[PDB]
Amino acid sequence: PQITLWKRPLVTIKIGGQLKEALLDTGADDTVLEEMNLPGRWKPKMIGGIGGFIKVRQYDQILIEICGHKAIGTVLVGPTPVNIIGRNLLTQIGCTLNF
Amino acid sequence: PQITLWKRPLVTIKIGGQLKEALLDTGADDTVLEEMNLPGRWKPKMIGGIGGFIKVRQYDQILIEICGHKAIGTVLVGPTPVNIIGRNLLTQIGCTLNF
Ligand SMILES: CCC(CC)CN(C[C@@H](O)[C@H](Cc1ccccc1)NC(=O)O[C@H]1CO[C@H]2OCC[C@H]21)S(=O)(=O)c1ccc2ncsc2c1
């Protein structure tokens, strides 16, 4: 699909058996999801943005389906106010900026 | 142009007659630039990011050229970690997401 930016680029994703709404975010290096109880091993990490840093849990090789396009990579879980699909997964679904 | 996302989508902008580097950030509602001097009036504003809220100076109707594409809109100036171009200006240059 083609997504205009009049409104936030929110799309439905599937992760860990759950459906969620997430932002297609070209400004996010990594993918950050709202707090969720994923299984498996993880590593602590801190990511910075406007307002400072938040502490997140890094899970590796996590499958996410973004509007039917499958992807697998690193997913950070923490107290983010928004589900954020970052460039690590946007590349995998063939997403591009165009103007 | 068509921009892939294997690298951070950085572009050169011209604002107030000065060239700068900025990040095309579809996850940002607004455009936020690092501390700089801008001519004209400004109002104190607050914006929230992943790490909290910050104080910014809001400049309205500012000319900004992004990759030779002209835009005129609101530009916030404050302690952002990176110069980001938000949807308020991305829409003006006809920017869309495509996958
Ligand atoms: C460093 C570049 C920007 C921050 C400057 C990075 N952000 C992604 C943005 O898209 C962020 C994503 C975002 C969206 C909404 C709430 C919190 C974060 N949006 C944002 O902060 O926009 C602000 C300006 O306009 C306002 O509209 C949204 C908030 C305001 S982020 O959320 O902080 C982020 C995401 C993954 C990541 N991986 C390593 S660092 C890192 C930082």
Q: Give the integer Cα–Cα distance in Å for B45 and A8.
A: 21
- Catalytic residue (one of A25, A29, A30, A60): A25
Q: Give the integer Cα–Cα distance in Å for A50 and B30.
A: 12
* Amino acid symbol at A28: A
Edge to edge, what strands does the sheet with B96-98 contain?
Answer: A2-4, B96-98, A96-98, B2-3
End-to-end C-alpha distance for chain A, whole angstroms: 15
Active site residue A60: no
| Residue B15 Cα distances to B61, B62, B67, B81, angstroms | 12, 8, 12, 18
Query: Exposed e or buried b for every residue in A3-21, given b needs 16+ CB within 10 A?
Result: bebeebbebebebbeeebe
DSSP symbol at B94: T
B14 touches chain A (CB under 8 A): no
Q: Give the integer Cα–Cα distance in Å for A16 and A33.
A: 12
Q: What is the resolution of this structure in A?
A: 2.0
Q: B35: Cβ below 6 Å to ligand 1?
A: no
Closest listed residue to residue B27, CA positions, set A32, A1, A19, A79: A32
A43 touches chain B (CB under 8 A): no
B87 touches chain A (CB under 8 A): yes
> Residue B32 is part of which domain span?
1-99
Backbone φ and ψ for A15, nearest 5 degrees, come out as -145, 140
Q: Give the integer Cα–Cα distance in Å for B24 and B2.
A: 13
Q: What is the number of the ligand 1 atom nearest to the C-alpha of A31?
A: 36
Where are any strands of DSSP class E within A1-99? 2-4, 10-15, 18-24, 31-34, 43-49, 52-66, 69-78, 84-85, 96-98
Method by which this entry was solved? X-ray
The count of structural domains within chain A is 1
Element of type H or E holding A90: helix A87-90
Work out the number of other CB atoms within 10 angstroms of the CB of residue A51: 17
Q: Give the integer Cα–Cα distance in Å for A48 and A33.
A: 15
Q: Which residues of A touch B6 (CB under 8 A)?
A: 87, 91
Q: What is the number of the ligand 1 atom nearest to the C-alpha of A80?
A: 17
| Distance between B64 CA and the closest CA of chain A, angstroms | 16
Closest listed residue to residue B37, CA positions, set B22, B57, B51, B23: B57
- Residue count of chain A, please give it: 99
Closest listed residue to residue B56, CA positions, set B80, B86, B72, B73: B80
